[PDB]
Structure formats: C-alpha cells, structure tokens
C-alpha cells in the first residue's frame, strides 16, 4: 500500500506582484520535493536527504516544468474571475492534488487528479480517467473546454505512465529513510480536576510515523464516548505526540488502564497510574 | 515527477 501526490497551490495578489505558485511533492505522505514562486532563485528543491541523488538535469527539467505550471495557474485564475464575475480587488486560491496509489504488485490501484477554487471542489477526474465530475455551472464550462481538447487522455498517460514509473524509482533510491520509525514512549499524569473526581492522561511522545491509537479502558471496557482526546500534533524534531484523558472518582484510579498501539511498537503498551 | 497540466480552465 503506497502513494505519490503532488499538491500545488496558487494565490492571487491584488497589486503588482503576480499570483503565488507553490508545489510540494509527497511520497507515502512524506514530503520529498518542493518549489516556491516567492523564492529568489525559484527551483524545485529536495526535502528528504535521499533525493540528493538526482542529477542537475532532474532539477532543471522539473523547474522549467513548474514555471510551465506557474503560468498555467496564473491564467486559469483569471479565467475563473470571468466565469463567476468577480471584481478586481481580490485574493483567490487555486489548488490541485494529483497522484497514483500503488498495489504491492507494482500496479496502479487508483489515480487522483482534482482541483479546487476557494477551497471548494471545482472539477475532478473520475476514477475511470475518461470522465470528469464538475461542481457548479462554471466547472461545467471547463469540462466543456477539456472534453473538447481531450485532456483526460493526457493526464491518464501521466498517472498510469509516468507517475507509477517514478514512484518505483524513488522508493528504491530512498530505502534507508523508508525503514525509519520511532517507537512512542508514554506516561500517565494525575490532575485533580474537581472536588470528588480527578483527571488521568495518557501521554504519547516521540513517535514516527503519525498514526496512533489511545484507549482508556475500565475493567476490560473502553470508554470512547466519555474521554477527551487531542488530534495528533508534531513536536518539531520530526517526531509527533498525542494524549487522551478520562474523569474518574477520587481513590479508584487503579481500575483504569490506558493502552497505546503503534507500528513502531513491537508489542502494544499498557499503562497505570502510580504515586 | 511533477504533474504537467494541459489546457487552461
């Protein structure tokens, strides 16, 4: 179960400077390349140390490619001012995600290519890769234009053709970084919330990759409906962190067990309060 | 390698 994606964003600027184009590439959700219009010498730059391999032509060709995209984006924004009839003073966001998930048989399992305008679904290539879906009346013009110019065929040829090829190349090229994971470490804390009740908290720290599960149980029973839980966050070192918490009566805190599941954990971790 | 786009909107 693998993927590659390219998330590109373009933002209008009223005044002199032109739209902003930023393109970032992720492999298995982990940033590997990036390119910013607002840089001084704007080029595609690697972001993982394993992309240091690729020869100066790689950079040059993707750079010039992306300047291609910058303009493609510039124009596409202005077109959309006309379709919706918007005034001159404004800022506007065009964004695009596009990619290819792979089966383990090194085989295209689904392709993605879609756009959005003011963070709303504009248009998107259906699963077939021969048919689009278009949201509001304006998208129905762009489908028109792209059904006339046989756009489907050419994306398709990248998604199946070129994208999949390069996902392999990257994977093999960057192998000693795709192994890496960090097991979480974890402790429990005791914060006397009310007169009568306390708050225990299961802290998970220093773990990569991102996904994780925290479960407070009371005598073999989960309390998911009662607990408080905070969406995982990044520490900054590249690790992550996340905790969960439950309300218990004073004195009876030794019933309550918390558990932590993680890829990096060989065996799952189970926790208890101690004074 | 990055998506190249074809026809403007």
């Amino acid at each position, epitope marked *: 179960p693998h993927s590659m994606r390219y998330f590109e964003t373009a933002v209008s600027r009223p005044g002199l400077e032109e739209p902003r184009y930023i393109s970032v590439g992720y492999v298995d959700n982990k940033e590997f390349v990036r390119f910013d219009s607002d840089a001084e010498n704007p080029r595609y730059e690697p972001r993982a140390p394993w992309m240091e391999q690729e020869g100066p032509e790689y950079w040059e*060709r993707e750079t010039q490619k992306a300047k291609g995209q910058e303009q493609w984006f510039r124009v596409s924004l202005r077109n959309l001012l006309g379709y919706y009839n918007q005034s001159a003073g404004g800022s506007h966001t065009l964004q695009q995600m596009s990619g290819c998930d792979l089966g383990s048989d090194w085989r295209l399992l689904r392709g993605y290519l879609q756009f959005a305008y003011e963070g709303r679904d504009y248009i998107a290539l259906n699963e077939d890769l021969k048919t689009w879906t278009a949201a509001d009346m304006a998208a129905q013009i762009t489908r028109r234009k792209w059904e006339q110019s046989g756009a489907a065929e050419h994306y398709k040829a990248y998604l199946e053709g070129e994208c999949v090829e390069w996902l392999h190349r990257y994977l093999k090229n960057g192998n000693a970084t795709l192994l890496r994971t960090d097991s979480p470490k974890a402790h429990v804390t005791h914060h006397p919330r009310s007169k009568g009740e306390v708050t225990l908290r299961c802290w998970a720290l220093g773990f990569y990759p991102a996904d994780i599960t925290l479960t407070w149980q009371l005598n073999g029973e989960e309390l998911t409906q009662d607990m408080e839980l905070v969406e995982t966050r990044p520490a900054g070192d590249g690790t992550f962190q996340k905790w969960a918490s439950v309300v218990v009566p004073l004195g009876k805190e030794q019933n309550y067990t918390c558990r932590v599941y993680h890829e990096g954990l060989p065996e799952p971790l189970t926790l208890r309060w101690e004074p | 390698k990055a998506v190249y786009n074809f026809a*403007t909107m």
Partner: T-cell receptor
Amino acid sequence: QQVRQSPQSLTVWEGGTTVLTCSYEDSTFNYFPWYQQFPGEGPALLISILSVSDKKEDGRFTTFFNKREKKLSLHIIDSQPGDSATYFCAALYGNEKITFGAGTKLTIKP
Amino acid sequence: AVTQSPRSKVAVTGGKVTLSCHQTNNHDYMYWYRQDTGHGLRLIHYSYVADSTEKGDIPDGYKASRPSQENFSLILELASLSQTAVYFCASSDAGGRNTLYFGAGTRLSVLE
C-alpha cells in the same frame, strides 16, 4: 540537432503511398504532433501521438511510433495532389517547448 | 485567428525592420519562428505574457516586443544578409501540449 527528418525533398505519384520518417535523440520525449504547411500559409496541426500509443490513424493519415530505436513515421495512403505541402515532425517532453524538425517537402505529382 | 503584417518586405542592409502580429485566440504564449528555404521552424523569441519576452534558440540579431496581450512584434535593429527569410507568428494556450496556431507568413528580402 534533436529531431531528424528525412528525406528533405520528395516527389511521388498520385495514388501512391507516402512515407515520412523522423528520428529523435531525447529518449524522454512524450508527445509528437505533425504539422502541415501548404504554400502561401503557415503551418497547421495535422495529426498527433503520445508515447503510450504505437499507432494513431486519422483517415488516410496515420502516424506510427517506435521506442526501442527511438523513431517514428507518417503514412499517407491515397496520396493525392491536395496533399502537396511541407510536413514537420514534432517532439516534446512534458509541457516543454515543442521541438520542430527540418521539414520534408512533399510534391504529389498529378 | 492569427494575422501578420506586412505580408512582404524588402530592406537595405543596416536598415530597421519591424514585423507585427496579432491574435484574437486570446492566448498568452506568442512565438516568432524563422523558416529558411521553406525548410525548418526555428524559434527566435517568445512571450508568455505582456510586457516581457524570452530568448528562443535563434535569438541573436532579433529583438522582440509584447505591448498588448494581442500584439507581439519582432524588430531587426540593423538588417543583415542572414536575416533574409520567411517569418512566422504563432499563438498557443498556456500549459503543455497545446496546439500552436500560426500566421499566414511574412517574407523578407534583405539586400546589399
């Protein structure tokens, strides 16, 4: 040069088949259109083909593609005198600037 | 619809020649190509927006101008015997693999 076109100049009889050839040196190139230039007029797109297809066929024009030897070609079947033009084989990668050949000058003698 | 003018021009060497083009295709890319002997299409200059331009493969001796979105122009500061040729304007939509649309052409004799 980057896109090579041969012959330079060609005369063939009405009714004949005609074969224009083309060879390219950027293995990475993807998409190949063919322009048609009738004298008195600027070029105009005739037929085009991706590197995933092996042939594209537009009704008495048909273009053939070959990766191994990095070569491709255009076949006119009936070859009548309303086909007397210069033909350009074109080549590009990604969204790069279309690269145009030298041209072959086709005279369909009636 | 692309349209060039003048359709034909004769010039003395060291002279100033300006050829203009004009497109109602509403495109942003515009290209000055040079055909020698009816043979080849070689890029001189192009322009992806007004009012800036970029050097092609044959930039030497040619200057370029994109006043409006619709108007793109080639300038031969001092005409030379090399520069005698047929000249082609073309527009195209931005993005990859779009079809260029050409002007009918401009022939230039530069004479001693």
